[PDB]
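Re: Re: ligand-bound prediction request (bumping)

Still looking for help on this. To restate: I need the protein modeled with pyridoxal-5'-phosphate bound, output as structure tokens. Inputs repeated here so nobody has to scroll up.
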Amino acid sequence: HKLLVTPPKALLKPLSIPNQLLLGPGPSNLPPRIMAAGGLQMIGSMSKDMYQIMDEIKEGIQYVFQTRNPLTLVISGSGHCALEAALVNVLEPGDSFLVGANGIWGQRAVDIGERIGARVHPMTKDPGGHYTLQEVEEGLAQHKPVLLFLTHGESSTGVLQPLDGFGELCHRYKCLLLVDSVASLGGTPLYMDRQGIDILYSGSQKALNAPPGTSLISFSDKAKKKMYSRKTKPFSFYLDIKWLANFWGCDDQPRMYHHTIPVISLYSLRESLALIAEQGLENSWRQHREAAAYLHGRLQALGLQLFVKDPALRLPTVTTVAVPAGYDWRDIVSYVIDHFDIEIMGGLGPSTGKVLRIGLLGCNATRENVDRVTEALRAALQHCPKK
Amino acid sequence: HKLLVTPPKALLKPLSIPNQLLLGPGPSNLPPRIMAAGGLQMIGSMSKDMYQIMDEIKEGIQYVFQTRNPLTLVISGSGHCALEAALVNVLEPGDSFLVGANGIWGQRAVDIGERIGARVHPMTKDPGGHYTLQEVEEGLAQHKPVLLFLTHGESSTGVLQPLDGFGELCHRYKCLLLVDSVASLGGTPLYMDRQGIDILYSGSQKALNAPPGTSLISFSDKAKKKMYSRKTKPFSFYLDIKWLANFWGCDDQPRMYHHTIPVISLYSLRESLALIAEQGLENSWRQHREAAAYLHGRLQALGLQLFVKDPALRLPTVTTVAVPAGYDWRDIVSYVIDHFDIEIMGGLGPSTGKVLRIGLLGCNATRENVDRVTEALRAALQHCPKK
Ligand SMILES: *Cc1c(COP(=O)(O)O)cnc(C)c1O
Ligand SMILES: *Cc1c(COP(=O)(O)O)cnc(C)c1O
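Reply:
Sorry for the wait, this slipped through. Here it is.
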């Protein structure tokens, strides 16, 4: 007895949130349908009905990845968590692991790869750079790796990465391909099977406009063959693919309790996958391409220059803009949220302080929101200090 | 081009869920306020306003743990994820790790401990058993471990575990104490600092009645000293306490992007911590003790016998009931959900097939719901096959 801690006074106020228009690299704003799914009641986490939803979510990930892999499921964690789940289950220690260290996502693949004791060979490249099929055949040949990691949408630098044939290249060296489509999914063409991709993951909170906290993953039979014949148990129980696979109905064995899935986020995820199914993929890529074009046009009208020179290399979901001469970037960003209720972002990792990041994602990739962010940025340029 | 996968027809139907009354070991039903928090709009995952919520959540975990540890935060994952985060950050490989293998939660602590390459010494005990301060001083002495794991609320067997002095015992052998309060928090007395606990974690989805997918953790300065002087980097980047700690404002350094936290679940978690703050802890323990008493009474009226003989050892949030002679347990459980819209559960792991599990958690631990489950179970006993 004798209770030390008293009820925090801050908790006895009611919860209240500002209305913000989020137009950075993520998370993005939720449409009404995702919100309505968020406010539903709980069902049992192993109920027949829960399985039925999970199966729909599967079919959903199969559509947006354009894959038919049986080993396709949701990771109960953020984008980082899917990446880690991928790496920890594919890589035994000491294995050869090649990584396109293009921006932060490469760096994290490194960090994680290091952490789980693999021999990681970093093809590091300056921010704004991208990798040709040569640079990767070169790396493939001289390091002879079991797995390559590539960022599709590089949201720290705004670089779209070409993907055609790279999957074939990697098979040619008996290697596995791992693609990060967290920023790219729903916004720019992507076909898992036809591009021969072995591990694809994405996030809930970008173009799909679901709340952050889940992530999507799918494994080819090749990578699936490895995982089921690795001789050591992976370092995570939480992310263990065999346990995971069984629970999501990707096995021959009935579903056995592994962990409690985030039921409510799954309602929302389902709905987000439904919305893009109804619209259809090619229309979503079309929407994002036309919006990003519109935006690009407007920023250059303001005398800003787009960080990535080549337009065919610019990521449509996340645009990098160079920090104009004589401006503190923090001043501009502050001004935008302070005076317009709009969130945009600066750089991240190697792109830090050099760029501004403006995202168009899903239901937010509209000409209306491009207008709103452009005016905000006009105002800042004319009202922020200049040296 | 040439798109292989077509929009799943199942996704083009609208989402719909059955109303169920969940009265197993978790998840539990959400009150209206948690639901309303679920349906809110997104704010930026690194906004000043998001930090402010996270700080309230901190103060919230400090209250329900009754701790003042600065190293207190949320894990973006399920109950299992907190456990793993605890173990992966405390234990370097080869370390001596003692675990009360009382039910499944011990077994998982084993599995995980094994996975991260520690020398795990399992004090295995038959289901329904609990550990005295002797059995643990014995184990402490002969294995000399750096960390002990104990389940407080053992939801697979319904055993409440005594905790007073065990923290002192462990310090006496220079050891660290790890407690699982996932099932027990909010339902039965628990004081982190006064019981000298070094690592406490719980779940969102039990007595707190938030949606599943986040979990609560707190570290004493002792365990915190270890983690900051371990010589090897842990096997997970996702759960790395230094990265985590920094982002949740538990550092001297400004918050640096680690991963995107589940913003919406955090709204809900906050509200759940507010609701128990307003009610007050001791009233919640009182509610749960009086409900579990009521329930116990009613089941014995039906001629069922409570799995745990000693009442002072029965977990109030999760009651184990022996499977009556001549009944298929699956028949009963089915009958309950089929005819009453009520979920109860069977055993789990070592308790499988031997028991029925009935949970009372938070806003659901009411005399009203005890009535409803008792009648359901009357009906099943009189309407299910008997050998
Ligand atoms: C935002 C982002 C991530 C990280 O996802 P989290 O949900 O923060 O874990 C990973 N990859 C890319 C390309 C991203 O844009
Ligand atoms: C339900 C439960 C867990 C597991 O939590 P998840 O949220 O399924 O990861 C762990 N410990 C106890 C005591 C539980 O009751």
